[PDB]
Design a protein around this ligand. Structure first.
Ligand SMILES: *[C@@H]1O[C@H](CO)[C@@H](O[C@@H]2O[C@H](CO)[C@@H](O)[C@H](O)[C@H]2NC(C)=O)[C@H](O)[C@H]1NC(C)=O
Ligand SMILES: *[C@@H]1O[C@H](CO)[C@@H](O[C@@H]2O[C@H](CO)[C@@H](O)[C@H](O)[C@H]2NC(C)=O)[C@H](O)[C@H]1NC(C)=O
Ligand SMILES: *[C@@H]1O[C@H](CO)[C@@H](O[C@@H]2O[C@H](CO)[C@@H](O)[C@H](O)[C@H]2NC(C)=O)[C@H](O)[C@H]1NC(C)=O
Ligand SMILES: *[C@@H]1O[C@H](CO)[C@@H](O[C@@H]2O[C@H](CO)[C@@H](O)[C@H](O)[C@H]2NC(C)=O)[C@H](O)[C@H]1NC(C)=O
Ligand SMILES: *[C@@H]1O[C@H](CO)[C@@H](O[C@@H]2O[C@H](CO)[C@@H](O)[C@H](O)[C@H]2NC(C)=O)[C@H](O)[C@H]1NC(C)=O
Ligand SMILES: *[C@@H]1O[C@H](CO)[C@@H](O[C@@H]2O[C@H](CO)[C@@H](O)[C@H](O)[C@H]2NC(C)=O)[C@H](O)[C@H]1NC(C)=O
Ligand SMILES: *[C@@H]1O[C@H](CO)[C@@H](O[C@@H]2O[C@H](CO)[C@@H](O)[C@H](O)[C@H]2NC(C)=O)[C@H](O)[C@H]1NC(C)=O
Ligand code: NAG
Ligand code: NAG
Ligand code: NAG
Ligand code: NAG
Ligand code: NAG
Ligand code: NAG
Ligand code: NAG
Ligand code: NAG
Ligand code: NAG
Ligand code: NAG
Ligand code: NAG
Ligand code: NAG
Ligand code: NAG
Ligand code: NAG
Ligand code: NAG
Ligand code: NAG
Ligand code: NAG
Ligand code: NAG
Ligand code: NAG
Ligand code: NAG
Ligand code: NAG
Ligand code: NAG
Ligand code: NAG
Lengths: 440, 121, 121, 121, 52
């Protein structure tokens, strides 16, 4: 009939949008966000949206990029007041350590000495310290790793590396949607959708080949990838059960320090008390055996019936991607994961060797490097696997078998495991309608 | 009854919550400020559209622009009682700029002149 | 009668100056930006609240919400002549959340529906 | 008649374009933010001034404050047909603050009182 | 033999010779929406109600 344009304001309609999110945390010095952010809402609200099928796509989620940039900038701030080690690039003559030692690959630990500067410009001192083979390159005469490629900064010993959960909250005019559907593969319409003011806290845990200290799947192991048929893509696997990791460093190392210049001091590994033994991490055999069987069953659903599934160690690449990185106590460990992936599937514990490196580059940036200070005493660290990163050696159509190897090298993929649940939308309050009416 | 709780409701039912929705519309230091400044600017721009239409005093208003029903062949009961606002926004997504242009030009321009003529005498 | 000169005056006398008060409501660079953005966000919040009440066009308006005598056991002449706004604001500070909620529920939500029905008919 | 195209026209003709003009009124990070914030504060102050005058809902309004014959020695039709707004603004630039004060003081202060009495009844 | 005091504690920066340390009176002003109240009382001990 005689229909007319009408206008409504406050209309409950939203559109896809990207905006800066405000960081907050539930949390003395720490490298993490607690210094750069504000307190959270003690009682977060959630509203279920009935009859809503809103589409999610984790692979396009901009929240991943926003977190990455905040984490990198956040981490860099912690090194700005800290000591520079530029004076330490020297001839560094070294010899083999001889002691009551079960050792490792021979030459792994070395006794080194160098001419070092003092508080006064007029004076020098002779010092010695222990170094790991990974941090030393032969020119006998030696150089520290990256002495010809980058400046090295010593991390301040007072600052903790222990992860602190980070929450993100919407600005006014925006809302964060959450997918509640169980067994969601990260894409397509979500059967159950709710709105939250803020996200659940996410810890910035850094690891390779395995995802540590994250969320678990609600019912069954979930396998997802940007493209399941493309062997190039990383496959993220979320476990529905925990598997622990027990790492230790038994050697009882000691720490000594010397003042360098008027404003700086250097910390180094001193004599080791007692027998010298290999650092290592345990993985339970029985638990892992069950865990693999569950993953294989789910893989068969994606890759078809009667395909023989095998696992193997990475064929190549840098230590960062061929080994499992840890940060325990501030010490950086690299472990050989072989024996976790050493299996074929058709139908009490494992001990992995580890190596310690004091010079690291967590974000793989060229021209950057950090020196961790040594930690005094024996270290024990207990954490758990909540997922895996896998890649295929396949893409071949000429076989009835398939093989998987660990992936890694991109930190953003770890955050996807917690952020796949969330989407950001903008609220558009204005709209119009046909209903018949009259006005003067 | 909470924010966006109306999303699953029919367009008619949703009208009960419009006021509730309105209340919620209003280095790192730079990023935070940019978000807040833009949120304010966006809010003000929507208010300007209403101010031109003369609808700024109300959440709900009528206009003098005819519906031109050929835009969508639906009955009022088919729209108001059987559909959400989310679905509706898609149905008229290609006509929104037209409707807004009609409101600013075909209504406000006639109304301001008639009111002025009455004021003059 | 300069800014806040009315603060010591009786609530009735203070009404003469409401316009004057309204006129005054509206890393160094970061300090300037944070102060200015907050001043604007605050200003708009007060205006939005009046807009819900429908009082945004006036410094003074009436509403359809009846007074609950339990909020204050006083006569009208007692409040207007024997009290300042500073004293009054403290006396009913427990009930301001209630009054604001009543204004929306009893007037804004009710009137927009009745007027829409008249417009529809 | 594009943006400011009206400036070349006489004052009467310019009234056709008021809506067009209205649409356009609304380290490195500091420059961006300060420019945006100042633009907003200026915009809001003009709306506040109209709100005091009671003309906030209209592009054009009339008041009951009489024109002082000393403000300009011109005929009414002469001003509208023989001048541009750019010229007109200069001729009364000495009296703008006086006119603004009169609108606030001489009229709106009385209307709010009469409305209170009518509402009281 | 001597050492400059605190060479064992900190770097030392020379003050620029062109920069005066002479005090300049500073006034503080309120942002919009705020006002500063000033007590006019005498023999005020800095606490309690101010009569003016
Ligand atoms: C520390 O001792 C080990 C073991 O003798 C040295 O490694 C040997 O190096 C020689 C000479 O090139 C080789 O012929 C051997 O095969 C190495 N033995 C191994 C790998 O078991 C190592 O060079 C010594 N380190 C230093 C600094 O002298
Ligand atoms: C910094 O020094 C290292 C060690 O000399 C260089 O790495 C060597 O590169 C040459 C090129 O002829 C190779 O033959 C060696 O095998 C490398 N040595 C090691 C231990 O890997 C490095 O190239 C120098 N600078 C840069 C930027 O690489
Ligand atoms: C998650 O599962 C959905 C199905 O629930 C996948 O959607 C597929 O989309 C493609 C588009 O070309 C269709 O051809 C498929 O038929 C759909 N599903 C199936 C089973 O074929 C979606 O791609 C999945 N996401 C991922 C990352 O695998
Ligand atoms: C590991 O080394 C530390 C020292 O770095 C040992 O701690 C010492 O324990 C003895 C016990 O009598 C104390 O008297 C010392 O004062 C301690 N040294 C400190 C606190 O610096 C520790 O016992 C060693 N652990 C062993 C041998 O298992
Ligand atoms: C990981 O498992 C290994 C093997 O059971 C543990 O090795 C034993 O450790 C105890 C001391 O805790 C020694 O007395 C045994 O001789 C070790 N057995 C060996 C070397 O075969 C290891 O301690 C476990 N790690 C942790 C942190 O519990
Ligand atoms: C982890 O350890 C294994 C050995 O246990 C390394 O692999 C060996 O590589 C050699 C040379 O290709 C083979 O001959 C061996 O058969 C491999 N394993 C064996 C024999 O058990 C593997 O490279 C190590 N991983 C890393 C990252 O160093
Ligand atoms: C994963 O979370 C667990 C539990 O918080 C971590 O274990 C704790 O580590 C901190 C820091 O060393 C200790 O103060 C706690 O006492 C530990 N809790 C225990 C042993 O129950 C574990 O370190 C985390 N993993 C990572 C990689 O951060
Ligand atoms: C869908 O909307 C209707 C509206 O009456 C509501 O009753 C229903 O609960 C909503 N969803 C479900 C699953 O019921
Ligand atoms: C090795 O053990 C022996 C016997 O306890 C002890 O005498 C010795 O000090 C230890 N190591 C060295 C380098 O002497
Ligand atoms: C330190 O310098 C002296 C003098 O040249 C030299 O004899 C000594 O070997 C140097 N020490 C080291 C560790 O190089
Ligand atoms: C996965 O990659 C294959 C390569 O042939 C492509 O055909 C297919 O469309 C991709 N699937 C996607 C993008 O979902
Ligand atoms: C750590 O030790 C516990 C027993 O204390 C064991 O249950 C668990 O599997 C271990 N975690 C590993 C080996 O990752
Ligand atoms: C390194 O060599 C020096 C030679 O004097 C020795 O005194 C020192 O104990 C050695 N350090 C270790 C850890 O063996
Ligand atoms: C894991 O346990 C099963 C029995 O539950 C056993 O058959 C299998 O051999 C074990 N591990 C491997 C690699 O097969
Ligand atoms: C293989 O196919 C059968 C049905 O013929 C099915 O029951 C079984 O689960 C399949 N195995 C897979 C998908 O691994
Ligand atoms: C890995 O698997 C191969 C093939 O079955 C076997 O020969 C090898 O011994 C296994 N490695 C370990 C450490 O069990
Ligand atoms: C895995 O480790 C985390 C560390 O915070 C702990 O909270 C969680 O309960 C663990 N899961 C287990 C032990 O199943
Ligand atoms: C419906 O509106 C369109 C413009 O959006 C117009 O072209 C068409 O003629 C209209 N139908 C009528 C007026 O019957
Ligand atoms: C809309 O529905 C009414 C009854 O509510 C009916 O009378 C009318 O014909 C319908 N309009 C159409 C189908 O265009
Ligand atoms: C409501 O719309 C649906 C499609 O969304 C349609 O199938 C159904 O018939 C409609 N119900 C009516 C018109 O009563
Ligand atoms: C509106 O435009 C979209 C493409 O952007 C088109 O798919 C849709 O059919 C159009 N709607 C109408 C009613 O023409
Ligand atoms: C203060 O009180 C006196 C009466 O004692 C009154 O005349 C005066 O106006 C009051 N001042 C103010 C600012 O209200
Ligand atoms: C006044 O407030 C009391 C306490 O909330 C309430 O019980 C009473 O019903 C209210 N009176 C209203 C209209 O009278
Ligand atoms: C308020 O009215 C009552 C009526 O009994 C009266 O007793 C009381 O004195 C009045 N209060 C004032 C301040 O006039
Ligand atoms: C108003 O609220 C305050 C804070 O709870 C309370 O101390 C005061 O007694 C209340 N006034 C009343 C209930 O009249
Ligand atoms: C008009 O202007 C004259 C001065 O030219 C002034 O004396 C008179 O008071 C004014 N009338 C007003 C402001 O009403
Ligand atoms: C105003 O009109 C009068 C006649 O009413 C005329 O005499 C006078 O010149 C006009 N003033 C002008 C055009 O400035
Ligand atoms: C305005 O009036 C003046 C009087 O000298 C005249 O010269 C001029 O042409 C007029 N402008 C017009 C009519 O546009
Ligand atoms: C306005 O003020 C200026 C000040 O220089 C003066 O020159 C001009 O004549 C004044 N205009 C009027 C109409 O008085
Ligand atoms: C620096 O020398 C002063 C001389 O008084 C001494 O008091 C102080 O402890 C020294 N500082 C350090 C860090 O050794």
């Amino acid at each position: 009939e005689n229909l007319w344009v009408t206008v409504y304001y406050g209309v409950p309609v939203w559109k896809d949008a990207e905006t800066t999110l405000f960081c907050a945390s539930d949390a003395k010095h720490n490298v993490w966000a607690t210094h750069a952010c504000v307190p959270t809402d003690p009682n977060p609200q959630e509203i279920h949206l009935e009859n809503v099928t809103e589409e999610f796509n984790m692979w396009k989620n901009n929240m991943v990029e926003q977190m990455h940039e905040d984490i990198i900038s956040l981490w860099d701030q912690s090194l700005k007041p800290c000591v520079k080690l530029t004076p330490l690039c020297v001839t560094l003559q070294c010899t083999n350590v001889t002691n009551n030692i079960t050792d490792d690959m021979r030459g792994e630990l070395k006794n080194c000495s160098f001419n070092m500067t003092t508080e006064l410009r007029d004076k020098k001192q002779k010092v010695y310290s222990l170094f790991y083979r990974l941090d030393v390159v032969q020119i006998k005469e030696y150089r520290l790793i990256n002495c010809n490629t980058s400046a090295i900064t010593q991390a301040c010993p007072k600052v903790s590396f222990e992860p602190i959960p980070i929450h993100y909250c919407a600005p006014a005019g925006f809302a964060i949607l959450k997918c509640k559907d169980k067994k969601f593969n990260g894409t397509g319409p979500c059967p159950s959708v709710s709105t939250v003011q803020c996200t659940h806290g996410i810890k910035p845990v850094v690891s390779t080949q395995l995802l540590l200290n994250g969320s678990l799947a609600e019912e069954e192991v979930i396998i997802r990838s940007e493209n399941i048929t493309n062997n190039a893509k990383n496959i993220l696997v979320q476990l529905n059960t925990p598997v622990q990791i027990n790492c230790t460093r038994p050697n009882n190392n000691t720490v000594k320090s010397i003042r360098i210049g008027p404003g700086q001091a250097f910390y180094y590994t001193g004599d080791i008390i007692g027998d010298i033994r290999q650092a290592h991490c345990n993985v339970s055999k029985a638990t892992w055996n069950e865990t693999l069987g569950k993953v294989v069953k789910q893989l068969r659903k994606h890759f078809g019936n009667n395909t023989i599934i095998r696992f193997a160690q990475s064929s190549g690449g840098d230590l960062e991607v061929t080994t499992h990185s840890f940060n325990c106590g501030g010490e950086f460990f690299y472990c050989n994961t072989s024996g976790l992936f050493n299996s074929t599937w058709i139908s009490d514990s494992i001990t992995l060797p580890c190596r310690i490196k004091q010079i690291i580059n967590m974000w793989q940036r060229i021209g950057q490097a950090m020196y961790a200070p040594p930690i005094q005493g024996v270290i024990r660290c207990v954490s758990n696997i909540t997922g895996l990163i896998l890649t295929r050696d396949g893409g071949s159509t000429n076989s009835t078998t398939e093989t998987f190897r660990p992936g890694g090298g991109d930190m953003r993929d770890n955050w996807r495991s917690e952020l796949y649940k969330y989407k950001v939308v903008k609220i558009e309050p204005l709209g119009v309608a046909p209903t018949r009416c009259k006005r003067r | 009854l909470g924010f966006l709780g109306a999303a699953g409701s029919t367009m008619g039912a949703a009208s009960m919550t419009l006021t509730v929705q309105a209340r919620n519309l209003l280095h790192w230091g730079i990023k935070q400020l940019q978000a807040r400044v833009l949120a304010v600017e966006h809010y003000l721009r929507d208010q300007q559209l209403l101010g031109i239409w003369g609808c700024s005093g109300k959440l709900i208003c009528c206009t003098n622009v005819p519906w031109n029903s050929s835009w969508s062949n639906r009955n009022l009961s088919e729209i108001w009682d059987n559909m959400t606002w989310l679905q509706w926004d898609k149905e008229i997504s290609n006509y929104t700029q037209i409707i807004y242009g009609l409101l600013e030009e075909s209504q406000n321009q006639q109304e301001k002149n008639e009111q002025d003529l009455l004021a003059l005498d």
